[PDB]
Amino acid sequence: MMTDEARAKLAAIPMLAGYTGPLERLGGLTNLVFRAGDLCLRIPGKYINRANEAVAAREAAKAGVSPEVLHVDPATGVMVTRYIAGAQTMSPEKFKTRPGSPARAGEAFRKLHGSGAVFPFRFELFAMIDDYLKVLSNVTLPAGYHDVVREAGGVRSALAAHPLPLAACHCDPLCENFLDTGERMWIVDWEYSGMNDPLWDLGDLSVEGKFNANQDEELMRAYFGGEARPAERGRVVIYKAMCDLLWTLWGLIQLANDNPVDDFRAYADGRFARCKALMETPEFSRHLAAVRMG
């Protein structure tokens, strides 16, 4: 049925029409993505924003970071991109397994942030956080929920203590969004793209890839063109924490709305506990103090 739904959409797209070969489903829950020949068909999943994605992906493509966007459907949101042969979809495991992969991720971000890409919307980290917090008012929440939120105020303040640079950021760099050839990474899924602190991307990937200290150095070194500095490193660590917090709160919202897409009472508890763990290390206050000090 899933494949038939997809082969229905082909009719529409002239460049895929009459493709009678095999259709391979490539990873992704919120986006159904099928490889048809040498092109990829992307179908939207039944709260996300497709107008943004279209503009974002085209800009990312122009910047040489995303695969070419060959077609968009203004009726359905359906998108045709070019398939990258001999490319590996990434994951935490492959980021430890494929030597140089973190560096290649840093090189991709570097190309992205350093590009002329212009994204229309501004990423609002604390707007979203406050939003989810209000909404709460209520499910059962994790131990130290209010501390982590209170302490996040200090983090916010540390980030507001100095002007931060603004770059065209991917904003949700899940491992699965990276396609690794041997020598370079491409990035896909630009639905959450926006102007943001470039180091949010680095922090997000790190937490999503379960990166160890070594991988983080390799990532930052490749990104910055030199060893990271204490203020830089501090921002990444800060976003590692805030990234988990953002999604933790989102996951609690899904648990209260009984979205049956997965075990939210679990997902939420995981990302929170990791976050809380990070914020409690004595290292974290040093990283915070380094961001505040600029």
Structural domains in the chain, CATH included, are 3-85 (3.30.200.20), 86-294 (3.90.1200.10)
Contacts of 254 (CB under 8 A, 6+ apart): 261, 264, 267, 268
Give the CA dihedral 232, 237, 243, 244, nearest 10 degrees: 180
Q: How is residue 177 annotated by DSSP?
A: G
Report helix, strand or coil for 146.
helix
The answer to whether 184 and 104 are in contact (CB under 8 A) is yes
What is d(CA 247, CA 268) in angstroms, rounded to the nearest whole number? Answer: 7
292: enclosing H helix or E strand? helix 282-293
154: enclosing H helix or E strand? helix 145-160
Residue type, 117: A
Token couple for 285? 């206050």
The answer to whether 238 and 125 are in contact (CB under 8 A) is no
The answer to whether 80 and 57 are in contact (CB under 8 A) is no
55, 142, 178, 240, 271 from 267: Cα distances, Å? 31, 12, 22, 16, 6
289: enclosing H helix or E strand? helix 282-293
Which runs of consecutive H residues, i.e. helices, occur in 161-281? 199-208, 213-224, 230-256, 264-280
The answer to whether 15 and 71 are in contact (CB under 8 A) is yes
Token couple for 147? 């501390």
What is d(CA 195, CA 198) in angstroms, rounded to the nearest whole number? Answer: 8
Residue reference for tokens 């997902």: 267
What is d(CA 66, CA 198) in angstroms, rounded to the nearest whole number? Answer: 17
Report helix, strand or coil for 198.
coil
Q: List the determination method.
A: X-ray
Give φ, ψ of 64 to 5 degrees: 75, 20
**Burial of 68 per CB tally in 10 Å (0-12, 13-18, 19+):** middle
Q: Cα–Cα–Cα angle for 131, 260, 243, nearest 5°?
A: 40
